[PDB]
Design a protein around this ligand. Structure first.
Ligand code: NA
Ligand code: NA
Length: 327
DNA sequence: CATCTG
DNA sequence: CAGATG
């Protein structure tokens, strides 16, 4: 956690770079299990050879650990930190819609900067375009104070369209968090479940309203269950307009809402732990359901959940306010 | 995993 | 359709 830090750290720069600049999924994937194991490693890695001893730990890595331990740095890591092309990709990638894949193509076309990007707006697709228009706004954290305002609206409108709608704002906003990165809404309606063959309108109807009143600014992707967009709190009495914010809304059959709600709420750590205990208690849990575990190895059969309460109860645990859902 | 692109 | 992004 801080004994073998720099090590796990450099390993990460390295793995990251593999995958993003080179195509090196293997290699990349290599550094990864590597940093994972040294991570768990209970001692102070004093040499490569020592490390080597570990699984996932081969010769090349060993080599690097040595040099790193040997000297406050690593050459390759130094060489990669300068490299314009390397930096290029790390940056372009910052744009929503631009991934690595694309980041390469661009660079090899010589698009490296923001300006490059504007100039070549023709090469970008819708998402990427938006992604570029909202670069700044996009990176700006979302303070809870707006969060609550947003949430307020979304909920009101959803209600308007249908009283039977059940919306929830998961994420850290849900966990207490003072700011968030984007807005995540879990949606369901009684009329929608596991078997119930579709009802796309269910999602589309709301989306509409959201743009009706202008909360929703642009559409990133709009499928029949998942929507990826942009929103914005009405700039009041003009002088201070708001940033644009990432927002998503997803339909979910009523019959697997809570697992979802739970799940989406996190934290990752809370999940796991809860996930593991569930398991002891003779259960299983994933994003959609809770199933009673048979003994023949495994087994299933969706346990019935009417709340987040229903879940814990099953696994016979202490109902956790979202706030203490931390770890 | 679900959506988009081409 | 594979293949990219989130
Ligand atoms: Na990106
Ligand atoms: Na292939």
């Amino acid at each position: 956690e801080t004994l073998n830090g720099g090590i796990t750290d450099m390993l990460t720069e390295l793995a990251n770079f593999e995958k993003n600049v080179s195509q090196a999924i293997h290699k990349y994937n290599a550094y990864r299990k590597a940093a994972s194991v040294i991570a768990k490693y209970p001692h102070k890695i004093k040499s490569g050879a020592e490390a080597k001893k570990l699984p996932g730990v081969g010769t090349k890595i060993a080599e690097k650990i040595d040099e790193f331990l040997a000297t406050g740095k690593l050459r390759k890591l130094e060489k990669i930190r300068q490299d314009d092309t390397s930096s290029s990709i790390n940056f372009l990638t910052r744009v929503s819609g631009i991934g690595p894949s694309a980041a390469r193509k661009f660079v090899d076309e010589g698009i490296k900067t923001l300006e490059d990007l504007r100039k070549n707006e023709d090469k970008l697709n819708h998402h990427q375009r938006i992604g570029l228009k909202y670069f700044g706004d996009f990176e700006k954290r979302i303070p809870r104070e707006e969060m609550l305002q947003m949430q307020d609206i979304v909920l009101n409108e959803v209600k308007k369209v249908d009283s039977e709608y059940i919306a929830t704002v998961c994420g850290s906003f849900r966990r207490g968090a003072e700011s968030s990165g984007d807005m995540d809404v879990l949606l369901t309606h009684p009329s929608f479940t596991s078997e119930s063959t579709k009802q796309p309108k269910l999602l589309h109807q709301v989306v509409e309203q959201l743009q009706k009143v202008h909360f929703i600014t642009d559409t990133l992707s709009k499928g029949e269950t998942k929507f990826m967009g942009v929103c914005q709190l009405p700039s009041k009495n003009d002088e201070k307009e708001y940033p644009h914010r990432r927002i998503d809304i997803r339909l979910i059959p009523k019959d697997q809402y809570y697992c979802g709600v739970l799940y989406f709420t996190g934290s990752d750590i809370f999940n796991k732990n809860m996930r593991a205990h569930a398991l002891e208690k003779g259960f299983t849990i994933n994003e959609y359901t809770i199933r009673p575990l048979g003994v023949t190895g495994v087994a299933g059969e969706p346990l019935p959940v009417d709340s987040e309460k229903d879940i814990f109860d099953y696994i016979q645990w202490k109902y956790r306010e979202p706030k203490d859902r931390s770890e």
